[PDB]
């Protein structure tokens, strides 16, 4: 019995899968082609676990999950026995996304909850949490993705149909908003920064209004460029939108039971692939 899992994540080396469902449990699997043997079940949430996310193995085996009970729970495998080492629930509503930073930033976490907040939880020398939070969106935040870089930044998708690009500032010590972008007529479900250290940067912003805008910024200066992936509404509301590391391929999880795939061509415009 597992009729509705909400999120799954793969570890750096892809040996250990972590699915999370609505019955509150987080199941860990040892994958091997066909056969994923169930190795664990983790019960510590008071509502459907929306998302899970491993951290960089540089920090051992850590997995931050966020669930409907408004609480972010950090887990850790310890000699082959899992244990909830920390928790971070400074958010008064259902926590939606949770995504670790690039491992060069430390062990930073990115939480994004419906109380219009988004936190960056550092884990200090005592391993204790060092929360520095910001207000992100009015009617709630559905998602928040990190950006790689070599001047740190992330993106957030809102319930006011916004897509925001925040940047760290030593003057403020809190991430200062640097640019907001408007293009959807309904709750911005997911936002994704692309890991392509190439000539430009790409953002795929899926939404409830069955659109997927692509914000391609030329460089560090010239603002983004709006590009409705295709100019027809998808047969059903879209949920997830993920970039590929090698290649800059885009995967779109529409509520139409297939996942589409879109690649950029020399027109600059985007074309299906599969």
């Amino acid at each position: 019995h597992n009729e509705l899992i909400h999120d799954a994540v793969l570890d750096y080396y892809g040996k250990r899968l972590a699915t999370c469902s609505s019955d509150k449990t987080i199941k860990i699997f040892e994958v091997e082609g066909e056969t994923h043997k169930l190795i664990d079940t983790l019960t510590g949430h008071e509502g459907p676990v929306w998302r899970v996310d491993w951290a960089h193995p540089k920090f051992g085996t850590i997995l931050a999950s966020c669930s409907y009970d408004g609480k972010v729970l950090i887990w850790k495998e310890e000699n082959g026995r899992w244990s909830q080492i920390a928790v971070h629930a400074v958010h008064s509503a259902s926590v939606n996304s949770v995504q670790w930073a690039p491992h060069e930033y430390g062990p930073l976490l990115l939480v994004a909850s419906s109380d219009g907040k988004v936190s960056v939880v550092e884990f200090k020398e005592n391993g204790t949490t060092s929360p520095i939070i910001i207000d992100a969106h009015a009617i709630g935040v559905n998602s928040a993705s990190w950006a790689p870089a070599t001047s740190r930044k992330f993106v957030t998708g809102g319930a006011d149909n916004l897509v925001k690009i925040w940047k760290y500032n030593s003057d403020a010590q809190t991430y200062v908003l640097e640019s907001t972008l408007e293009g959807h007529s309904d709750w911005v479900r997911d936002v994704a920064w692309s890991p392509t250290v190439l000539l430009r940067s790409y953002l795929a912003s899926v939404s409830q209004d069955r659109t997927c805008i692509i914000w391609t910024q030329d460089n560090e200066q010239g603002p983004w460029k709006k590009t409705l992936l295709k100019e027809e509404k998808f047969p059903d509301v879209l949920w997830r939108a993920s970039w590929s590391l090698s290649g800059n391929v885009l995967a779109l999880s529409g509520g139409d039971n297939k996942v589409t795939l879109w690649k950029e061509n020399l027109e600059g415009k985007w074309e299906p692939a599969g």
């Binding site: 750096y12 250290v197 949920w239 999880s253």
Partner: protein, 503 residues
Amino acid sequence: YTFAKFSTGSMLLTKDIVGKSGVSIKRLPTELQRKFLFDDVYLDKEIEKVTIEARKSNPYPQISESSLLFKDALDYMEKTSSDYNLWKLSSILFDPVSYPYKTDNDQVKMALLKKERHCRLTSWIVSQIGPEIEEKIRNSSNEIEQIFLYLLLNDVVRASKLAIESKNGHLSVLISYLGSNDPRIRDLAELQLQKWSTGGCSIDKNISKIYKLLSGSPFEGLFSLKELESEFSWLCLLNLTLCYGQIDEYSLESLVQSHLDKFSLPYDDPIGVIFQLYAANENTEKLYKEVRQRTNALDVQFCWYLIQTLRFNGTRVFSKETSDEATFAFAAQLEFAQLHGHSLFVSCFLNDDKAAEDTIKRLVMREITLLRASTNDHILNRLKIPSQLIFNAQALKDRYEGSEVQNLLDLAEMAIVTSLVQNNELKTLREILNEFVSINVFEVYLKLVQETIDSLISGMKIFYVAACCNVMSQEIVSKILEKNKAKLLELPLQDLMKCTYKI
């Protein structure tokens, strides 16, 4: 509701309630469709053809010499497949010819090389059009037309023979000139054609065609074979230009270009594309870019191989950015095919050192395990993968699988925590001395063995879980051994129970 993101090992997980986990491990459909690529022998022999040098802005490998030729791939393909035709024709036009015999001076050499290339190209075209024309000869009901068709197969002698046999003797004589570029005959033939085409009550339809061939400009003309556009493969007519056409005064390229200027080729036809890229000479890249946005006849792999050959043979010129674009694309296709060694190898052909560094590093660290199996995987990490990168990556894989020699080459304290035998401690101390946190060093120095300093160090370390308690217990035992007194009592002034037992 659905969810799907991309894996580290770029592949896709989606909701799937037919499986056991509630997700599906999908092998991302690879565009990379070319069999020999999944065979590691090809890759080994392909690395044998390369000279790898470290960059002048970082230690990461990038290619200094390549001896790759379109020629080389041909062994791994069927001589029957259209692909083989593409690669072969590409070899004929682009791979350097060698002329083994010594030549009085070097411009003669150049000339001979031109003749050789020309002869191979035209033999090949005749190979292709062969059955087409032979079919046409099968169905002809007229001898002079057959003679013409034999000229279409660049068989001057059989044409001459049929002429002889069909009682067309003068024609026969004329034919024997085909393929000598005698400008006298050229202008005479053209003259005869004008005289006919000014009065000339009637001349046989195919005799005029043959004269037009002798004219050296069979479409370029005023009695033009251009209308044969509708009766013959474009390649067949191109054969006509290449064989007769005016070989000596023109270069192979500008000749082919001359022909192409008279006839649009189908956008989708790739042997067409190759001729266009060959003829385009002065701006191959320009055309290549045009070809890119117009068609997919040239695949990712081919475009990369092409660009690389031409680059490393001086044959032609491509932007650092276009060569890198091609290279990225192919390396990516390869990585989507779980062909990491091969993707890595390709990744090395990057000009942008920054990008090469990132790509290479990222991939090696993410995928180190698979990249350390056979000797064909060894030569791989003996591309010139930086010692640092290889071991560093290997360090990460150990921390995650629950290393030390790597770290030796915060985190160190965590390793020391994991470690808590004497010989190993000594070796670690030696490594630390070679490298030269301080508190741990003091503790180690004490363990190898002033007492008060060691005590203060241990206390400081305690201020900074099972391992630590064990170390504390060991220190306690040592102190107890030392007391066996007043100084020891002065220094002192389950853990609680032990402390009580001590007092």
